[PDB]
Every structure is written in C-alpha cells, then in structure tokens.
Amino acid sequence: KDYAREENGGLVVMASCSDERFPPENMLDGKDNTFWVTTGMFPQEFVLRLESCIRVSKITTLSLNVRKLAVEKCDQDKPDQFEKVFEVELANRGLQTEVHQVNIRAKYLKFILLQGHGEFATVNRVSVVGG
C-alpha cells in the first residue's frame, strides 16, 4: 500500500507553518486538488509519521512552486534522530511531480522545502509506497 494516506495511519505531526484552510492533512487524502501551503519564508518542513516502521521502495510528491526539496528518514520510534535520504532542485511554472524509488526502513519522514520559486509554495500530495 501507500502509508502516506490518513487511512493507512498516515499522519503529519510537526509542520513548521499552517493555515487551517490548507492543513497538512491535505497531503495524504489522495486528492490532487487539495494542498498544504506555506505561510511565508523558507525553509519550511513537516514530519509525516507512518503506522509502523516500514520498508520504502518509492516516495513521491506533488507540489507547486517548490525549488529545492530535501527528505530525511527516521527508523526509530521516537523522532529523535533523522538521516538524509535525498535532495532535489526543481523547476518553474504553476504542478510538480517527483518520483523516488528508494530502499530504506523509516517510521518518520521529514520533508523540507529549502527554497521556493516564489514567496509561498504548496504540497498537494505526498505518497509513500512500500511494505
């Protein structure tokens, strides 16, 4: 499955900025038309927590206006210590998709928007595949 989804226990717990109109939850409802939006500066981050610490084969994001993005794993069951997974510069316009096949155990996944193409940015979908 995809443990991103609220329904496979997917849950954001440590977002760095929020507007109740576009809450982190909007990243894991599987819809493409809802999103989470940043409220100002950079960087910004948020921490997704999956039901169990699982093997991740592929990670994938749907975003608007993101330029540099970084992702970090934590296989322990308290988000004590994170370890870098990757880092990606993106490009222009107004939706971005990204795919990353990876092979890691993780329980928490941190996503950092390190810089944007504008003043604000959005994340519409986050998908985490593996078992």
Query: Among 68, 75, 79, 98, which residue interacts with another protein (rule: CB under 8 A)?
Result: 68
Query: Among 4, 24, 42, 74, which residue interacts with another protein (rule: CB under 8 A)?
Result: 42
Selected range binding another protein among 3-11, 34-42, 46-54, 100-108, rule: CB under 8 A: 34-42
Residues 6+ apart with CB under 8 A from 20: none
Q: Using CA atoms of 32, 85, 47, 123 in order, give the dihedral in degrees to the nearest 10.
A: -20
Q: Which is nearer to another protein, 13 or 101 (CB)?
A: 13
Q: Which is nearer to another protein, 3 or 111 (CB)?
A: 111
Tell me the DSSP string of 38-75.
--SSS-EEEEEEEEEEEEEEEEEEEEESEEEEEEEEE-
Q: Does 118 bind another protein (CB under 8 A)?
A: yes
Distance in angstroms (rounded) separating the CA atoms of residues 84 and 111 = 10
Query: Among 7, 19, 51, 87, which residue interacts with another protein (rule: CB under 8 A)?
Result: 19
Residues 6+ apart with CB under 8 A from 78: none
The answer on whether 34 is annotated among ligand-binding residues is yes
For residues 3 and 128, the answer to whether their CB atoms sit within 8 Å is: yes
Distance in angstroms (rounded) separating the CA atoms of residues 43 and 28 = 21
In the complex, the smallest distance separating the C-beta of residue 81 from another protein, rounded to whole angstroms, is 22
Q: Does 35 bind another protein (CB under 8 A)?
A: yes
The residues of the shown chain that bind another protein, judged by CB under 8 A, are 17-22, 31-33, 35, 37, 39-43, 64-65, 68, 94-95, 114-116, 118-120, 122, 124
